Design a protein that fits this description.
This is part of a larger assembly, with chains A (156 residues), B (124 residues) and C (63 residues). With 156 residues, chain A is an alpha/beta fold. In chain A, helix 3 links the parallel strand 2 and strand 3. Chain A is 35% helix and 11% strand. Chain A is built from five helices and four strands, in the order H-E-H-E-H-E-H-E-H. Chain B is mostly helical and 124 residues long. Chain C has helices at residues 7-12, 37-42, 51-62, and strands at residues 13-15, 21-23, 47-48. Chain C has three helices and three strands; from the N terminus they run H-E-E-H-E-H. Chain C is 38% helix and 13% strand. In chain C, strands 1-2-3 form a three-stranded antiparallel beta sheet. The chains are: A alpha/beta (156), B mainly alpha (124), C alpha+beta (63). The chains hardly touch. Chain A binds nine RNA strands through helix 1, helix 2, helix 3 and helix 4. Chain C: Belongs to the bacterial ribosomal protein bL35 family. Chain C: One of its GO terms (molecular function) is structural constituent of ribosome. Chain C: InterPro entries: Ribosomal_bL35, Ribosomal_bL35-like, Ribosomal_bL35_CS, Ribosomal_bL35_sf. Chain C: Residues 47-57 have a biased composition (Polar residues).
RNA sequence: AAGUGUUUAAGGGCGCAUGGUGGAUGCCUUGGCACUGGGAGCCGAUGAAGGACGUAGGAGGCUGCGAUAAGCCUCGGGGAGCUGUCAACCGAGCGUUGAUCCGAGGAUGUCCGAAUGGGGAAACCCGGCACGAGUGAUGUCGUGUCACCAGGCGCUGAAUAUAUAGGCGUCUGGGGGGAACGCGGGGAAGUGAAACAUCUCAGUACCCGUAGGAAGAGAAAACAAAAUGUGAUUCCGUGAGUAGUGG
RNA sequence: UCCGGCUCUACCUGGCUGGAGGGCAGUGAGAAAAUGUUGUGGUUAGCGGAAAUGGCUUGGGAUGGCCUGCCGUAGACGGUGAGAGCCCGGUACGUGAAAACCCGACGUCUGUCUUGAUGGUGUUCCCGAGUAGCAGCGGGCCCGUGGAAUCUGCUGUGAAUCUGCCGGGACCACCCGGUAAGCCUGAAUACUUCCCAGUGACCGAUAGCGGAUUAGUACCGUGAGGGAAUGGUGAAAAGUACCCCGGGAGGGGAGUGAAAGAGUACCUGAAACCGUGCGCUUACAAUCCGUCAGAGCCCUCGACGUGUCGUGGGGUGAUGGCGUGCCUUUUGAAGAAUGAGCCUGCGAGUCAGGGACAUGUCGCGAGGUUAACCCGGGUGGGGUAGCCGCAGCGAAAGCGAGUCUGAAUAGGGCGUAUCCACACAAGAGUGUGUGGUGUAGUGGUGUGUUCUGGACCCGAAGCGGAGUGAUCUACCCAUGGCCAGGGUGAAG
RNA sequence: UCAAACUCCGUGAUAGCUGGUUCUCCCCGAAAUGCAUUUAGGUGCAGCGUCGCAUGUUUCUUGCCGGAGGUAGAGCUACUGG
RNA sequence: GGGGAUAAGCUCCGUGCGUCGAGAGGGAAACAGCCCAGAUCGCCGGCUAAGGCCCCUAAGCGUGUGCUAAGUGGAAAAGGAU
RNA sequence: UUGUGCGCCGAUAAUGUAGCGGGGCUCAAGCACACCGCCGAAGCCGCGGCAGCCAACGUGUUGGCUGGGUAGGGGAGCGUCCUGCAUCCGGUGAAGCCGCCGAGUGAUCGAGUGGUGGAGGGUGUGGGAGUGAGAAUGCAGGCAUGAGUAGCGAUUAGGCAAGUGAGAACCUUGCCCGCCGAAAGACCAAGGGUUCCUGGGCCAGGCCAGUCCGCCCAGGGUGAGUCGGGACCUAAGGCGAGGCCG
RNA sequence: AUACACGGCCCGUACCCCAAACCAACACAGGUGGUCAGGUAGAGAAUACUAAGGCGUACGAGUGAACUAUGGUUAAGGAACU
RNA sequence: ACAAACCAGUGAGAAGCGACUGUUUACUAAAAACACAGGUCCGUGCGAAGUCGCAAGACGAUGUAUACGGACUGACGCCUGC
RNA sequence: UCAACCAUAGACUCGGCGAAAUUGCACUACGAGUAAAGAUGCUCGUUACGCGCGGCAGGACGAAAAGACCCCGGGACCUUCA
RNA sequence: GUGUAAGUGCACAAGGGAGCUUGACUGCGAGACGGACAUGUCGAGCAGGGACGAAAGUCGGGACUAGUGAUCCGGCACCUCU
């Protein structure tokens, strides 16, 4: 009611009119009036601990590994000719599933682009690995450099 | 998110107004006034389901008293004689007999008159 | 915003190691002639606050 | 003879069936809100911002434009329909010899408005000077120009002598607007303190003066504490709701 | 480095000033403009951009379903007659600027050094004056005048130039630091009228901007200023030719349409409310309006037998019994105490914070955790500064499983996580030693209360700031106008 | 409209006051007392409720036992008074 | 028990006193606070409490012995009264 | 004469019996004492269902006890919307709305059905809420009650004929009558702003109707040396170069 | 001085203007300054009637109700009303 | 019945208050209240005093103590005591 | 006293347009009671065919205005040797 | 009679008298009373150094219960604190 336009003046005398008491036309009960306890902009970012995050990631990848859903490859396709046909066929060999998480370095633009337009595919970098994407994936597919990067980051 | 509440709100209204069919005036037409009466109506129904046992007992007793006094005995001494004769028949069925089998009622009256003492106004 | 602690309560109350809240005792600043020394001794030092006042005192002290 | 006995609906009530009003609900949207990332962060006396009045072949509103008036020139782009729109209809036309449309640069740009030739109830009244046009001449028309203040420069230098104040001329500039942010100043009260004045609210709101795209501050007459210490300023986090301050 | 001319004058020797090689920088705070050439550097228009007329079926229509293929650096988002990667705009991706503008680069050009620096020895001069400092009154600093430094305004007074001065929280000494009273200075920082591209566990027409619509409009007000309401036919107007009733409106036929139960009053089309029709009921009755029982009537579903019965269901309700509305607030209201005409919508414990307390849960664990910030087109990875725990007692110095008090080994306070066993003292309530067990917090997050905030919502009279108003009204100023007719009869 | 106009802003002024505060069921279940209060229609604490944790019959009832009282009643030539 | 007129549907206290409050149901004609009794729901089953059993109104114009003549019952004082 | 059990008087208000709740009761249906049965509650019992606490035994059944409830505390849930994920339905008709037939201890449910309708929804598991209204003399819209009720706006007064027209108390024409006549006439200013005129119209407006209109539409209409104003003058007062003050 | 020939600008000008067009939310019994001021009676701009001129001004038709309002008349009495 | 209608003073006596004419609470008070002329007191020696203004400046006043301002009283008569 | 009559405008009737405050409901009786101590709504009785029209105003503690008196709380303005 | 109100007590004396004295102390205080909290109250006993007493023992003000004022702020004296 403070942010709404107007409503500064009392609409009428407090007494005499037979009307209810009012102090602003923009009060909440009024049509056109303020929202009492409404949404305001707020940041929902929880301040999650690092060990909790990492442990969740590792649990996700461990579920996938136990159920044999982690595959690894050298490269999704050959050099500098992004071929979604090739990537699709390759992932079809590796897995019949819809939901796939491709983990590849930030420099494998060719493989990224080749596998990008596939519907059930999500591409990520190993330094950005996350529980949500890993769990939304029915299968995970690392490049070898990306896998070993995750390994060498999480070992020491 | 913002929620238009008509959809959840109209349900109780439909319920109440469908329950309040047969009511006169506002009580059948308006939620706020049908609601007032459904309170009273269900209070009354709860009360009356329990008073109905008493009312039907009252009725059965009236009929038993009638048939008994036609067989030349009071209700009280009839009940006394039946309890002394070990007749566990309930007043409902006694009334039904009084209406439908007056001969059987007379037989039970004879039973009770036998089972009664010789001086009902004595301490014994 | 950070919750402020009540200044007077932080000046009049103190925690021990076990979390006991203690207080100095009144009737000791002045008018001490007629106050016998047994009384002033009783009023000396510190005492644990009452169970009744504990909640309010802890609220004031913490914020 | 005595007794029993329906049958009425002027209208009403309940239910059902069909409708009407009304515009809820559901599903939408041409709109809006909060944000993000970038740009640009000023516009104005070469007349702004914002407007009045007009302007299309046809009445008005919005839009655009300005007596060159839904428009003119050039440079590109684009490519076949077009003559903005409410909103059609009529009547006219244009267009591959490239329209409409898009972008950039220019031109024109009435009148008001700082508004500035003078006046004025803003958008309308009256002019001077120069040049030019037009008239038998006066009238009339057009193009420029003509405010105030400051600062320079040049001439003059009152009472009055020095000389100055001032006056004349010329040149450069300002003037006003703008959502927020900034700097410097001024500075409440409701309120809270369960009263109230100190205090708080709050250096808030508001106001004033000023800017810049950022500002301000800034290169120690600083901190520090005996550590061979750090080494402009600003900002962020902590220190810490601590030390302290406080009717 | 070279040359020249001065260097009062010519003569030997000491400084300056021009020219020349060269550096050194530059449109910058560090001096200032202009000038060109020039960057597939950018912005201001855009352009290209793969792949299905696929079959069958439903349908008005395929963008649905089933099945076939195809592209994919393009399955982003929309549109198209219904969920479209392959129909369209487009997307990924790649191209594109004549001119203007902005960034650069190269140079012209400008400035400066270039007669220059190098490193040493002992005295006089200078090192920012109405200043500092001091006093008085004030301001602001955590600091509310307090012992009140530092900083700072006004008024007075008023110094020193380095063995000088200022600050190091009154002050003095020593020591340290610095060198005021002169100027400039980018970046990190704050913001968005406006422009572009995008996003939303944001609204979706009583919402969301007041404004999806004529919107700061209409309207209100003298004025400042206040300030609305109004969206959806259909896929396409195919927007109902024509006939009939009618003055028209409106309608009926006919037609369009998939649908007119889509007819510019138009998607769906609730309720209040208004009617019409059918069934039942009601005109001897005292009714919080219903409930319980229930006659009769009507309808319906089954059965048998053919209309009476049922494990029945419904609508009506004669009649009998019982029965004092809802809310609020109250000792207590049916209450003749408050509020509500009805319906539909809207309308009130929410949000932020490493906040506080408690609790739950998860992680780790005597450790836990990062904040700002950095890198990441993300939710991820770094980040040890700090924070909480880890030893307390004490006013504190300080001491330390002890410590404070106190003259005390003499008791008490607080603390030594807790428990177990033993031993010794006691039975003034139990203690003291030994051994052992060995201490559990922290950060996320949910919940409940709470703090600061509008803080569950509504509500004053009134206070303040800045402005609008004397076209009403009060008074005044200037200038004009009006006061039929008849009487009385002052001074002079 | 005047015992200090109006408008906007501060401002969602503050109100120990009034009103309102929207779905359900299950279990438990008060108080209207004390003290203090620029307090008395408010509030703090205690009392009373609930939940959780810990303890476990300590509660409560009855019987018996040990106890202190100065009421009722009675008495006053046992006091003070009448 | 105080105050009050040993008045108030008065007021102020006390009472391991009650009920209402916050408690329905039955009785008391009706009637929060009296009596009975503490409502988990259902039943067209039974026994009871208080209170009642001529009809309203369920149950008795009950039995026995007396009393009452005033409709006492189904309000009332000092006091009067073959 | 004593005491007692029943009685009498005292007795005495005002809407209406009205001091048994009523009828009526002494042929007690009144009082006392005994006695006998019965009625009578949501109490108790019986049969069945549910929930809470606890116990036992077994790794979910039985049993016991309890289950009124305001403020209030705790627990567990329904429904609405938006969402992550996974699934499912849908132009062979989703939602919403209206119903039928039903279901659940409750909020409520209906992947049961029809109708209407025309495009998005359901379910499970989590996440988040502008999450539930009957009340605030609440806000907005729509619609009732009063109610087809009051009123239809002065103090002058209308009438007839004829016409027009679909339609006339009201419009037009004519004739009468009546009203004003220091006005209810004529002209200006201020103010308004096209209301003027012509033609046309009649679903809004006009307090009825309406062929009429100050309403709607279109078009037309305002001609100045002398009128009222400026270009002439000044008053009050205002602005106010410079200026002073702040 | 005469004659001839010429220029005389800008705004307003319709219409209502004691009102249905202005201020009054309305076609509102209110308000709105100025100028003309006929006749007969009459002192007169009063008042009555009337001319010129303009209206019948916008819901009507009826009907002997009470009652209300506005006007009128009133026996005898004459403020007894109040 | 002759001012014929319309139009068009009611009058007298006394008291209180206020001298009077006027003004006033727009929208419940028109009055005995306010003002008034008249009176007294006080101030003011002049960009006075007083007032609006921070100041300048302005009014006072284009006035100058027979004037100006403020206060009280309120024609007039008799008076106005301590 | 003491009121009667006449007209007109309304009221009444017909036609036309067409509000309002109010409103928890409703097939809204009376008595004596009872009750938050003044009852259409409860008890016991009595009375009452249903629906309208004109009228009256006793009640609906009638409508209107969140009582102005009183008190409590808070304001405002005013006064003063606060 | 008990310093002084009243009550409880005191004759064993707590009442009256005399002598000596300063315990009308310092550090502490088991345990209790009372208790919303803050307040308040009693206290054996240990030590120090004392008074009285032959000694036992008593003495931390008064026969008891009232004779008083939180906190803030500041003052004074002392202190091996800062």
């Amino acid at each position: 009611r403070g942010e709404v336009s107007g409503g500064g003046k009392k609409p009428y005398r407090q007494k005499g009119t037979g009307r209810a008491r009012q102090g602003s036309t923009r009060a909440p009960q009024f049509t056109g009036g303020g929202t009492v306890h409404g949404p305001k902009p707020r940041d929902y970012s929880q301040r999650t601990p690092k060990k909790m995050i990492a442990a969740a990631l590792r649990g996700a990848l461990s579920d996938r590994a136990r159920n044999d859903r982690i595959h690894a490859v050298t490269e999704l396709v050959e050099g500098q000719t992004p071929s979604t046909k090739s990537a699709k066929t390759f992932l079809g060999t590796l897995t019949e599933n819809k939901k796939v998480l491709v983990v590849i370095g930030r420099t494998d633009e060719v493989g990224a682009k080749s596998v990008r337009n596939l519907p059930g595919v999500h591409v990520i970098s190993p330094d950005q690995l996350n529980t949500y994407d890993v769990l939304n994936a029915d299968d995970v597919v690392f490049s070898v450099e990306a896998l070993n990067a995750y390994i060498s980051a999480n070992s020491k | 998110a913002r929620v238009k509440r008509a959809l959840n709100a109209q349900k109780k209204r439909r319920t109440v107004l469908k329950a309040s069919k047969g009511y006169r005036g506002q009580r059948s037409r308006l939620y706020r006034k049908a609601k007032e009466q459904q309170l009273h109506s269900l209070t009354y129904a709860y009360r009356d389901r329990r008073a109905r046992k008493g009312e039907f007992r009252k009725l059965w007793i009236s009929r038993i008293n009638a048939a008994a006094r036609a067989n030349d005995i009071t209700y009280n001494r009839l009940i006394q004689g039946l309890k002394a004769a070990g007749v566990e028949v309930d007043r409902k069925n006694l009334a039904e007999l009084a209406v439908s089998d007056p001969a059987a009622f007379t037989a039970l009256v004879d039973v009770a008159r036998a089972a009664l003492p010789e001086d009902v106004n004595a301490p014994s | 915003p950070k919750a402020k602690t009540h200044s007077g309560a932080s000046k009049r109350f103190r925690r021990t190691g076990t979390g006991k809240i203690v207080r100095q005792k009144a009737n000791r600043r002045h008018l001490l002639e007629h106050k016998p020394t047994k009384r002033t001794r009783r009023l000396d030092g510190r005492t644990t606050v009452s169970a009744a006042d504990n909640s309010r005192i802890n609220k004031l002290l913490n914020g």
